[PDB]
């Protein structure tokens, strides 16, 4: 009856007059837990609806002529585009801060930091800093293994030295993930089969410096795997982080399911994995040990972000439910000791992340 995670419903977007036809991947963006943006045609007029998560009942509607809108993670600063035309607005100042005209259509973009926008075209990936008069800079050329994929995500490590572009396609009647991992320092791309990924910072006991970890989940022919790998040469003095591989279970009735989102808690050093068809998984970042699995919904959660408050994950499903999952800090250690019968893991996590319940085992 005790669970190692807590669910929370924050919002139903249909209670704010959002039309369910605009609650999907291409029209609703949530770049952080602070804002949701929804593009709606209301009559002849395209609008953006901006939901301040601190003031959810008072959304603002504004006319637009943008094909895409993404809010900055921290600030009421919005990035808008129409084809090759990119504009950045400070909404409170009602002021155009920056503009750039690309020579290619931007097929995917997102904020990768407080101050940087990543742009994906048919053939390349760019970073656009909001500092000063910075224009977009090419990071790498897209690998041929992603040619004709739907681009679904782009992620980087904290220092923006490891870059990961993720595409999906239909091959032999399943959804196949094609990732491109790029080293900024070595100027090499590695194609990887993968569905969802995140980077993370992790300091091993007996290490002075944090390790940079690359975590990805895949449903291959082999089946479900999660990988946790140090990228880059360890900081000098550091022990290397030993690579972990573990299975990702799919039940027999979820033969068509696959991973769609990953967030890592650096407070708890856990990996949250969400599948296309409504399953949640929790893994230990250090060992890859599966802690917990369950169905949220039949419903696809199509966008997620870190949930800063709970060091968890927040998302929106096609119904317009805004839902978060985090570690239940009171239950996780008892749950691992008693339900998982893993006092070893229970005790490690208890002292590593300063949690209660490994006093008695």
């Amino acid at each position: 009856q005790i669970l190692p995670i807590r669910f929370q419903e924050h919002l139903q977007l249909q209670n704010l007059g959002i039309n369910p036809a605009n609650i999907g991947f291409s029209t609703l963006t949530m770049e952080s837990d602070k804002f949701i943006c929804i593009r709606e045609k209301v009559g002849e007029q395209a609008q953006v609806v901006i939901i301040d998560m601190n003031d959810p009942s008072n959304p603002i509607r504004r006319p637009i002529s943008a094909d895409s809108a993404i809010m900055n993670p921290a600030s009421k600063v919005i990035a808008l585009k129409a084809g090759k035309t990119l504009q950045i607005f400070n909404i409170e100042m009602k002021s155009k801060m920056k503009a750039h005209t690309m020579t290619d259509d931007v097929t995917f973009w997102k904020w990768i930091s407080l101050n940087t926008v990543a742009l994906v075209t048919d053939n390349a990936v760019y970073h656009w800093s909001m500092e000063g008069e910075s224009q977009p800079v090419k990071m790498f050329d897209r690998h041929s293994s992603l040619a004709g994929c739907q681009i679904i995500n782009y992620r980087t490590d904290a220092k923006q030295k490891w870059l990961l572009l993720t595409g999906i396609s239909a091959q032999q009647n399943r959804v196949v993930g094609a990732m491109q991992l790029y080293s900024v320092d070595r100027k090499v791309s590695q194609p990887i089969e993968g569905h969802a990924a995140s980077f993370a910072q992790f300091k091993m006991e007996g290490n002075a410096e944090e390790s940079t970890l690359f975590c990805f989940a895949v449903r291959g022919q082999a089946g479900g795997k999660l990988h946790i790998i140090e990228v880059g040469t360890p900081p000098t003095g550091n022990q290397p982080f030993p690579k972990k591989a573990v299975d990702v279970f799919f039940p027999p009735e979820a033969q068509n399911d696959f991973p769609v989102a990953m967030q890592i808690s650096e407070k708890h050093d856990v990996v949250f994995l969400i599948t296309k068809y409504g399953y949640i998984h929790l893994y230990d970042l250090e060992t890859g040990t599966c802690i917990y699995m369950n169905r949220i919904s039949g419903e696809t959660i199509f966008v997620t972000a870190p949930h800063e408050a709970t060091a968890g994950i927040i998302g929106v499903n096609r119904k317009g439910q805004v839902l978060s999952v985090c570690v239940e800090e009171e239950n996780i250690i008892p749950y691992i000791t008693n339900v998982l019968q893993n006092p070893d893991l229970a005790l490690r996590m208890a002292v590593r992340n300063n949690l209660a319940g490994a006093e008695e085992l």
Binding site: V48, R62, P63, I64, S65, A66, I78, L80, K81, A82, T85, Q87, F89, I91, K94, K96, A99, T101
Partner: peptide
């Protein structure tokens, strides 16, 4: 290029 958002 016109603004892609109207604040009016």
């Amino acid at each position: 290029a016109a603004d892609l958002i109207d604040f009016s």
